Design a protein around this ligand. Structure first.
Ligand SMILES: Nc1nc2c(ncn2[C@@H]2O[C@H](COP(=O)(O)OP(=O)(O)OP(=O)(O)O)[C@@H](O)[C@H]2O)c(=O)[nH]1
Ligand SMILES: Nc1nc2c(ncn2[C@@H]2O[C@H](COP(=O)(O)OP(=O)(O)OP(=O)(O)O)[C@@H](O)[C@H]2O)c(=O)[nH]1
Ligand SMILES: O=c1[nH]cnc2c1ncn2[C@@H]1O[C@H](COP(=O)(O)O)[C@@H](O)[C@H]1O
Ligand SMILES: O=c1[nH]cnc2c1ncn2[C@@H]1O[C@H](COP(=O)(O)O)[C@@H](O)[C@H]1O
Ligand SMILES: O=CN(O)CC(=O)O
Ligand SMILES: O=CN(O)CC(=O)O
Ligand SMILES: [Mg+2]
Ligand SMILES: [Mg+2]
Lengths: 337, 337
């Protein structure tokens, strides 16, 4: 089958941790990244050890899953190589593949992203250079992965590989970056990322026609977060975030998250435009601590269950995945309901 | 259901003429149009009168239908108002709706697109300003349709309208621009347009999840064409294009189209990444003159049928629409197979 994982809020909803579980649990042949580039920080906890990737998909754990990066994604050579080293224990380097049509993040781009009054001060961007690079790509002057000789051993056709796999019945897992709220089209412009992030865009990033997409999982966290500036309707004061212990720092910039309550009307909208078939809710332990570690649905505390059900009815999409903690095992899998 | 129409070559495959037929024939409630923007020239012949639109979707013909422009599309106010005027007898002004999140083409964009040595001289672009506009949008500096007061009476939520329609069971027809060969990701970079053009991107442009897309029509012409520079594998000398009477001029720029022989390998690739369910072939009358006007498959000349069948086997997708001339009636509809 086909599964696409996207964010339903402003990113950082726990997409990495979910692609993580699905990789190990469902054993996909191919696990691919779509999204923008390296502006994303996806974290996963593996038996007490927290990892964080930006370029390589969050599934390296699967020593038997081909790891791919779609043509629509930006590639930062420095970051890609650092993560080859950072994940050597998983033999990532032998299982990885960069589409030869990917655009390249150069140091001129990182610079611009890090210095300019508008992207750095006002928006304010990540500094990954993803913004200015796509601008160069739109202007068709940026270079492609084909033109970087240090990347030649890893060059491939991700679009072909993925489609070739789908023909033989193999399972393909696709990872998107950010969340619906950061969509260049449907997000809170101009406080967004440099590209649409919805499931349709992610499919185009890896090279999959919309008809070939079987499942679309949209990830939500119990308390939505925003890094950087921009409107946040259900935003809470920072004093409350502490009290409820909702303090988190960026995985790339290291800046505080801005925390808020679950926006249901936004959730319904985000889920529907994505064409969500299944919802996934994370950090339920942060909504109610008594739900920590729980792996069966009906052993959830009651205050936790009325949250999942309130979501399921005000969004109109079943929740088939509930994460109850940082660890892999901290997950409820209601794929049979 | 849902049908998305996209190009399989380098644009100008007759997408307009096909969205045309489908609008009148199948009577869709909505007829959104994706693509990049106004850089597209879509022509249709209505009972001897040839029309050409850039902003308003082909399908204005259908007076019962709602005409929409997805948020992912660029909007040129001048062109939009000119085409409201160019098409009054169809009363487009009342049935049209622009997504309030569309980015705006300003004259600063147009000038740079027409003058700059790289975009104008090497590529060379259309001059619609779609390139620089998207660059300004990626940089999140562009204006949105909400911010243009002259556009307020036509502002709407295309994503909502389309999805609301798909819930009532209504038919939604979606029009894309260009062709696969001009895709920013998978086309002939840098000789491409400023955005991915495949069906998944087109779906994201209007606000439709990949799971909500029922049918994907990829349009091919008997002899592929290229406007502007860039690689063209099966390109013929211009002497042969006149010899075969294959001379066509740009709908927008009036530039003469480079002509070539049917590229079968590029068609299978283009069709497959698009996730094509159905093929549509136009200008069969240009491949064999004896096929002109034929509206039934049974009566096509032999040389005509071995072309359609050679396509069907070397591309691996059934051809359910065969256009045999400029007029609406000049069509073979094998959608029942
Ligand atoms: N307490 C708790 N933490 C979780 C749970 N699920 C995931 N996390 C952690 O929450 C953190 C936030 O997620 P991110 O690191 O931003 O990963 P992401 O959602 O892929 O981020 P983006 O790529 O920017 O979209 C991660 O470090 C996870 O380890 C959970 O159920 N409970
Ligand atoms: N002779 C003949 N002409 C056709 C046929 N189908 C379409 N045409 C004409 O061919 C021309 C070329 O198409 P375009 O005007 O570029 O429309 P398009 O394919 O939507 O162009 P793009 O928007 O750039 O993708 C149109 O003016 C049509 O009127 C056909 O079957 N036979
Ligand atoms: O993965 C991420 N998680 C949360 N926000 C992000 C992430 N990546 C980019 N953003 C936001 O997107 C905007 C611009 O980022 P950029 O253009 O990708 O560099 C800023 O508001 C960032 O905070
Ligand atoms: O609709 C069209 N038909 C054929 N080629 C197009 C069309 N629109 C843009 N192009 C091509 O796309 C390139 C750049 O156009 P732009 O989208 O205006 O920047 C040039 O090669 C153009 O000829
Ligand atoms: O995931 C990325 N962030 O949360 C922003 C940052 O790294 O600062
Ligand atoms: O369809 C548009 N073109 O063929 C380019 C032009 O109009 O010049
Ligand atoms: Mg993150
Ligand atoms: Mg055209």
């Amino acid at each position: 089958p086909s599964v696409i994982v996207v964010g339903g809020q402003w990113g950082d909803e726990g997409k990495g941790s979910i692609v993580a579980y699905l990789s190990l649990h469902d054993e996909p042949e191919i696990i691919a990244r779509g999204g923008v580039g390296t502006n994303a920080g996806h974290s996963v906890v593996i038996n007490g050890k927290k990892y964080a990737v930006r370029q390589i998909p969050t599934g390296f754990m699967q020593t038997k899953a081909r790891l791919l990066i779609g043509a629509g994604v930006l590639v930062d050579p420095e970051v890609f190589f650092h993560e080859l080293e950072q994940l050597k224990d998983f033999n990532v380097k032998d299982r990885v593949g960069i589409d030869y049509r990917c655009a390249i993040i150069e140091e001129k781009h990182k610079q611009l992203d890090r210095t300019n009054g508008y992207l750095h001060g006002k928006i304010g961007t990540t500094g990954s250079g993803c913004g200015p690079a796509n601008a160069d790509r739109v202007m068709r002057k940026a270079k492609q992965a084909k033109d970087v000789k240090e990347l030649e051993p890893y060059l491939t056709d991700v679009a072909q590989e993925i489609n070739d796999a789908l023909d033989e019945g193999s399972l393909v897992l696709v990872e998107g970056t950010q969340g619906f709220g950061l969509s260049l089209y449907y997000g809170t412009y101009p406080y967004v990322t440099s590209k649409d992030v919805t499931a349709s865009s992610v499919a185009a990033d890896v090279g999959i026609g919309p008809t070939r997409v079987d499942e679309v999982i949209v990830v939500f966290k119990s308390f939505p977060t925003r890094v950087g500036a921009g409107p946040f309707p259900t935003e809470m004061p920072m004093e409350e975030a502490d009290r409820l212990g909702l303090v988190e720092y960026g995985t790339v910039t290291g800046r505080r998250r801005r925390v808020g309550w679950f926006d249901f009307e936004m959730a319904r909208y985000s889920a529907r435009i994505n064409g969500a078939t299944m919802l996934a809710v994370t950090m339920l332990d942060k909504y109610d601590k008594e739900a920590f570690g729980v792996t069966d649905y009906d052993k959830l505390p009651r205050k936790a269950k009325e949250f999942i059900e309130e979501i399921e009815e005000r969004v109109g999409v079943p929740v088939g995945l509930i994460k109850t903690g940082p660890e892999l095992e901290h997950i409820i899998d209601r794929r049979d309901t």
